[PDB]
Write a protein that binds this ligand. Structure first.
Ligand SMILES: Nc1ncnc2c1ncn2[C@@H]1O[C@H](C[C@@H](N)CC[C@H](N)C(=O)O)[C@@H](O)[C@H]1O
Length: 261
């Protein structure tokens, strides 16, 4: 069993009450207060991200794990956190987001953050059946967690099948969620894909400990398997601390306002 695949068994053996304490222990979390007011009051201009995803992407872009440029395609865009953040960035010219939508799946939110005129999101789109289109930057943030690691595995491999046909079109900047990176079939697929399109895996500290998500990003490199194990070790280390402490809070990204040419 991989170290992740021990962390999962452990995770599942936790009481509802220990679960709650653990999921946010020592993680980075952002101050979303003002964002749900804007949300209540429909303030589309306050600069408040529509979701937690904006901060996660910003963590990876600021460290040059991905450098969005040209036309961005955002698969699984949900409310649009990644799309609106990308729209603020200088290299970016056009952002095309796609998301399933429907009941129980997030609908895109219309906002007037900086570069919003550059954003087009289409809900009602199941990306597993959408044909690929040219792009310079590929995002994908899809992966429904699950107590079963085999379910998470099949979900992950299906995503990594779908993404390959987009990467075949040339974008050299990408950022793709890997929900279940500790399963062997997923590690094997990533090495194959890494041989073909490069990049490597990074653990965003804003992720909750209740999931092992990692992001295959074009600006990382190095051994896929060991990067996975290193994060596995962190998550296990946090399950075994005796004094809990809570998350480390930080301010959210301000996405500003206004149109871009
Ligand atoms: N087959 C699918 N096709 C399109 N969207 C999907 C599909 N499966 C799941 N999704 C959506 O993918 C989105 C995943 C979210 N984590 C995206 C959040 C987004 N990155 C943000 O920052 O706001 C969910 O909103 C799903 O509804």
């Amino acid at each position: 069993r991989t170290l992740g695949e021990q962390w999962k068994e452990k995770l599942n053996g936790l009481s509802k009450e220990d679960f709650l304490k653990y999921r946010k222990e020592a993680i980075t979390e952002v101050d979303r207060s003002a964002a749900r007011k804007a949300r209540r009051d429909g303030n589309k201009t306050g600069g408040h991200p529509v979701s937690r995803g904006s901060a996660k992407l910003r963590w990876m872009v600021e460290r040059q794990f991905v450098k969005p440029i040209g036309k961005v395609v955002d698969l699984g865009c949900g409310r649009g956190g990644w799309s609106y953040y990308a729209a603020t960035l200088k290299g970016v010219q056009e952002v095309r987001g796609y998301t399933k939508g429907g009941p129980g799946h997030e609908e895109p939110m219309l906002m007037q953050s900086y570069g919003w005129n550059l954003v087009t999101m289409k809900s009602g789109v199941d990306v597993y059946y959408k044909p690929s289109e040219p792009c310079d930057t590929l995002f994908c943030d899809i992966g429904e967690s699950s107590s079963s690691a085999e379910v998470e595995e099949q979900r992950t491999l299906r995503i990594l099948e779908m993404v390959s046909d987009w990467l075949q079109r040339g974008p050299r900047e990408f950022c793709i969620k890997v929900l279940c990176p500790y399963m062997p079939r997923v590690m094997e697929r990533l090495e194959v894909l890494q041989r073909r399109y490069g990049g490597g895996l990074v653990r965003v500290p804003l992720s909750r400990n209740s999931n092992h998500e990692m992001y295959w990003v074009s600006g990382a490199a190095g051994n896929i398997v060991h990067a996975v194990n290193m994060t596995s070790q962190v998550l296990i280390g946090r399950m075994e601390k005796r004094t809990w402490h809570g998350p480390k809070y930080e301010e959210d990204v301000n996405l500003g306002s206004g149109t871009r040419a």
